[PDB]
Design an enzyme around this catalytic site. Sequence first.
Site, PDB file in Angstrom:
ATOM      1  N   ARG A  10      86.693  31.079  50.928  1.00 41.39           N
ATOM      2  CA  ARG A  10      87.871  31.333  51.745  1.00 41.39           C
ATOM      3  C   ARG A  10      87.783  32.698  52.427  1.00 41.39           C
ATOM      4  NH1 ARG A  10      92.347  34.223  50.385  1.00 41.39           N
ATOM      5  NH2 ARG A  10      91.984  34.089  48.125  1.00 41.39           N
ATOM      6  N   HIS A  12      84.964  34.609  52.963  1.00 41.10           N
ATOM      7  CA  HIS A  12      83.736  35.052  53.608  1.00 41.10           C
ATOM      8  C   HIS A  12      82.939  33.990  54.351  1.00 41.10           C
ATOM      9  CE1 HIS A  12      84.359  38.843  51.660  1.00 41.10           C
ATOM     10  NE2 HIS A  12      84.339  38.288  50.462  1.00 41.10           N
ATOM     11  N   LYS A  39      94.351  43.022  54.304  1.00 44.43           N
ATOM     12  CA  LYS A  39      93.046  43.322  53.724  1.00 44.43           C
ATOM     13  C   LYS A  39      92.317  44.218  54.721  1.00 44.43           C
ATOM     14  CE  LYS A  39      89.055  41.155  51.475  1.00 44.43           C
ATOM     15  NZ  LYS A  39      88.069  42.221  51.797  1.00 44.43           N
ATOM     16  N   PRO A  40      91.983  45.463  54.367  1.00 43.66           N
ATOM     17  CA  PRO A  40      91.495  46.401  55.402  1.00 43.66           C
ATOM     18  C   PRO A  40      90.120  46.065  55.934  1.00 43.66           C
ATOM     19  CG  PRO A  40      92.403  47.583  53.486  1.00 43.66           C
ATOM     20  CD  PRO A  40      92.235  46.135  53.082  1.00 43.66           C
ATOM     21  N   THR A  43      84.185  40.701  55.706  1.00 42.47           N
ATOM     22  CA  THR A  43      83.005  40.193  56.394  1.00 42.47           C
ATOM     23  C   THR A  43      83.027  38.670  56.337  1.00 42.47           C
ATOM     24  OG1 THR A  43      81.774  42.180  55.761  1.00 42.47           O
ATOM     25  CG2 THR A  43      80.500  40.277  56.515  1.00 42.47           C
ATOM     26  N   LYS A  64      76.726  46.739  43.145  1.00 46.05           N
ATOM     27  CA  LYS A  64      77.371  48.048  43.184  1.00 46.05           C
ATOM     28  C   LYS A  64      78.041  48.366  41.854  1.00 46.05           C
ATOM     29  CE  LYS A  64      78.349  50.077  47.056  1.00 46.05           C
ATOM     30  NZ  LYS A  64      78.451  49.563  48.463  1.00 46.05           N
ATOM     31  N   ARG A  83      87.464  44.983  60.562  1.00 48.41           N
ATOM     32  CA  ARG A  83      88.006  46.208  59.981  1.00 48.41           C
ATOM     33  C   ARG A  83      89.347  46.503  60.622  1.00 48.41           C
ATOM     34  NH1 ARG A  83      85.935  50.648  56.550  1.00 48.41           N
ATOM     35  NH2 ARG A  83      84.138  49.247  56.340  1.00 48.41           N
ATOM     36  N   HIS A 117      81.093  36.765  45.034  1.00 51.48           N
ATOM     37  CA  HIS A 117      81.541  38.080  45.467  1.00 51.48           C
ATOM     38  C   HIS A 117      80.609  38.546  46.575  1.00 51.48           C
ATOM     39  CE1 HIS A 117      81.004  42.578  45.172  1.00 51.48           C
ATOM     40  NE2 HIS A 117      82.314  42.530  45.344  1.00 51.48           N
ATOM     41  N   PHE A 118      81.180  39.161  47.599  1.00 56.82           N
ATOM     42  CA  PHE A 118      80.406  39.755  48.676  1.00 56.82           C
ATOM     43  C   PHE A 118      80.226  41.234  48.365  1.00 56.82           C
ATOM     44  CE2 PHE A 118      78.631  39.370  52.859  1.00 56.82           C
ATOM     45  CZ  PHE A 118      78.640  40.673  53.302  1.00 56.82           C
ATOM     46  N   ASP A 119      78.981  41.657  48.173  1.00 56.78           N
ATOM     47  CA  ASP A 119      78.729  43.029  47.738  1.00 56.78           C
ATOM     48  C   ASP A 119      78.448  43.926  48.935  1.00 56.78           C
ATOM     49  OD1 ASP A 119      78.739  44.400  45.115  1.00 56.78           O
ATOM     50  OD2 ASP A 119      76.725  45.018  45.651  1.00 56.78           O
TER      51      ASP A 119
END
Lengths: 122, 121
Positions: A10, A12, A39-40, A43, A64, A83, A117-119
């Site tokens: 959802r 990414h 959401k600031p 991607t 990370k 962004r 998760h998008f790292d």
Amino acid sequence: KETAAAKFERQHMDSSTASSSNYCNQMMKSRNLTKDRCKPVNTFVHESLADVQAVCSQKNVACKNGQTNCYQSYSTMSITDCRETGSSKYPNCAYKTTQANKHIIVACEGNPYVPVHFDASV
Amino acid sequence: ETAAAKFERQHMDSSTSSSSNYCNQMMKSRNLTKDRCKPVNTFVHESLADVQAVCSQKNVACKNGQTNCYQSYSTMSITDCRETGSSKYPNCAYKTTQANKHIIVACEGNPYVPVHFDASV
Ligand SMILES: O=c1ccn([C@@H]2O[C@H](CO)[C@@H](O)[C@H]2O)c(=O)[nH]1
């Protein structure tokens, strides 16, 4: 509860492929990333779900957060960075849209073993 | 008529954001009462781009068992049209019901676009 894999899709995945400056405003709203807050940073990846899921079989790298279940795509992928602008004010969330071709790094888990998760993009 | 155009004719009504006579008029004007009274039909009051974007949202099973259905992450303004019990072709009569629900559509083709309205939830 929404699974982590479903949340990754959802937040990414947008495989339909971003040309417009308003792409991020519409997508961020349509993916429920502006409901309570803007959401600031986000991607979106414009490759097939299959190509993105395949990253979990590519270059193992540290996450990370220090976990070891992160993977970098061997190839670059078509992505869009969203962004939030300097003047953006909830509930009228405004975003700058930037297209790019970069490697992605995702955390993978579960059965099927898929991104949760998008790292980063690199 | 392409399947994508058929979906727009049968299920898109972005000009509206629906009266008690709405379904009676729309079911006739969109040719959904030409051959028979279509028993149930939903119109979506979102932009075409917003509905088309659903083909990249939550993949869910279709009612017929195919795997090419997608549920919108956000709720969408829709109107359900349901044929009344007293309705008799060719004078098809409908009850009009406005709602805000997630929609489920089937997508196909290149471009990958909605071709069937599967359900609202
Ligand atoms: O909520 C619903 C359920 C069904 N249908 C229509 O009825 C057909 C058969 O169920 C579908 O293909 C679709 O066109 C709707 O429009 N909305």
